[model samples]
Target: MSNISLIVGLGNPGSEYAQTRHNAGFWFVEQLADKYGITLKNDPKFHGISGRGNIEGHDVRLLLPMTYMNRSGQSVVPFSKFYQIAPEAILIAHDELDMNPGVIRLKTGGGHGGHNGLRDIVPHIGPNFHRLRIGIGHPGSKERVSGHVLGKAPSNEQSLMDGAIDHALSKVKLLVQGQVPQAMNQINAYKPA
Candidate 1:
């Protein structure tokens, strides 16, 4: 029941990719920082933008890797090493193409499911970290995945994703306090009406 100490959001860098569906991870971190009054700042040593704050009476670190989507491990490993945060104490939020939009799920210690960001992270830190899987739905065809993820979702889908993010944010206290099973039960059961 180790409380999560480091939360990392996986996505490509730059404004060009800001609104794209693949940047859902970045979206979560950005909103979290805003909601908690944490000011994220660029740190070359960490190879990402990060901030420190207190949540649920526990100190927490939030990071958004500045590396390209596939190079995420480069940033995450350095940051975690400097802080001595174990894999079990890290949480990563990334887009999931397996579920429909507005569906967010939490999982622990599993394979990467072909996600480039998660795939790269595995070699550096193993697959024991918690994952905040933010669903973005999938394109009908495998060939279209690259284009679909890199492109912006329709306005309707965008709002659904935003709603899902809001839901995840509300459970941060539970996560920070190491109440992961309780947090999962609530988050996994959410449905937009």
Candidate 2:
């Protein structure tokens, strides 16, 4: 719908958290902002950082919750309320450990899959919102899962991840224009660049 206005990227706050695998959502949003020359600055009222710009001739607002990963909904709820954007009109980009690096999946809600960020968001926004799941691969052992996501990608995997982020930015543009199916197809058909 043309009214689809909010695009939220789930991640922890602070410079120390930048570039971590868990911050895939943040990275993707940053890439989109850079591509479009948008700026994401502090927005205290929303309890998160945000950028406003036009994409595909539609007004778009990109958000990065400063509430950290686990309490992501704190920022999302306020932003949604302020803008009167419906849950269906909102899309979230975040990391998925189940899928390998360079892989991505887009869907409209389900279980949170042990992701605290998603877990927090689902309750506030319901299960009907869109999600862009950027894969970061599994850690093999449960004990290492936390470390794996919070850690940076190895040098060899950086290029592949960059390509994935670029693809995601394109998909996000399509989605904001109410071309969800087309965006899904483009993302699904993408290959490493």
Candidate 3:
């Protein structure tokens, strides 16, 4: 029951991809970094932006993969390896289309479900890691899914998702303390206050 050591956020780099549903992971990590006054720096060797900081007295490294959607592992693997962190010690925050906006789910491991980010990451770290799934909702058609994820959702939907992110962020203390069950309970039971 080791605490989370590395937090990886999957998203493409550059301003063009900002605010898209695919960047929810990055957005959450950004919020965490901002709140802690940690600055993310670009590391070409790791193929992403990363910062090291503390969360609830636990040292944590946050990474946002810049290696595009399909190769997020490039950023994650190197950072994990360099820090000697095991796969289970890493928590990934990724967008989930099956869930409606403003919802969130926390779970250990499962299939990638056609997510390019997780697809790339699985090979490097295996599928037994943890996840903070941020909801982005589905587009109703498989073909339209890619477009929906890459494009910005309506402002209302975006705000709803932001609410979910905030809720998830509130549980960082539980997460950093390696209290996964406690964190899961609070995250899953969240409702707007």
Candidate 4:
């Protein structure tokens, strides 16, 4: 059995960044809070919005760091350390540029693969935590990647992203219960319908 305790969603804070592809992580946490009836509030100590809620019988803490995308570790490290939650017990939900907008993947312990947020997080917590990679699809050229993630996706892509989040939401129970392989099987196979 796995003792997944903290669920973190990485993103920049502000109304402008709220709709960007990079904020998909924030979207997941907000939806999770809505579904679980958890109230997230700004906490100075945590440097973010946070709350505690139950998922699949496990009581877990949810975080959406306001430290901006590249400085995410500044919020995560202190919060996790204060709670004494181990690195492996934490799950980070973030956007993925390598997959289509409607797809999601679950995995653990890997290099950041050029994600700035993950890059910053590694030194603070190591690369051993779980990850829910919410696919945002890649821009056609490397030069456009920065603009692509920071900008709002087209409506069609947004809908697919919504569908992907829903699909991942349905599998959260398995994920919280340490049934990651099972969760991955369903999530990785999802496509826009």
lDDT of 1: 0.92
**Alpha carbon deviation, residue 125, candidate 4 (Å):** 1.2
Residue 111 displacement in candidate 2 (angstroms): 2.2
Over the stretch 1-193, how does candidate 1's per-residue lDDT look in tens digits? 9899999999999888999988999999889988888899998887899999987789999999998899999999988988999999999999999988999999999999999999989988899999999999999999999998899999999988899899989998999999999988988987875
Please, what are the lDDT tens digits per residue for candidate 2 over residues 46-131?
A: 78999999877888899999998999999998798888889889888899998888888787768798988999878877888888
- Tens digits of lDDT, candidate 4, 19-125: 99999999998999889898999987878999998877989899999899998998999999999999888889999999889988888898898989899888888
Number of the candidate with higher TM-score, 1 or 3: 1
Q: Clashes per prediction? A: 0, 0, 0, 0
**Poorly placed runs, candidate 3 (over 4 Å):** none
The candidate that achieves the highest lDDT relative to the unseen native structure:
1
Compare candidates 2 and 4 on lDDT and give the better one: 4
Better of 2 and 3 by lDDT: 3
- Candidate 3, residues 33-151, lDDT tens digits: the string is 99888889988888898899888899899999889979888888878888899988889999999899999989898979888899988887899889999989999998999899999
Candidate 4: worst 10 consecutive residues by lDDT? 1-10
Using lDDT, rank the candidates from best to worst.
1, 4, 3, 2
Ordered from best to worst TM-score, the candidate numbers read: 1, 3, 4, 2
Q: How does candidate 2 score on lDDT?
A: 0.84
Regarding TM-score, does 1 or 2 come out ahead? 1
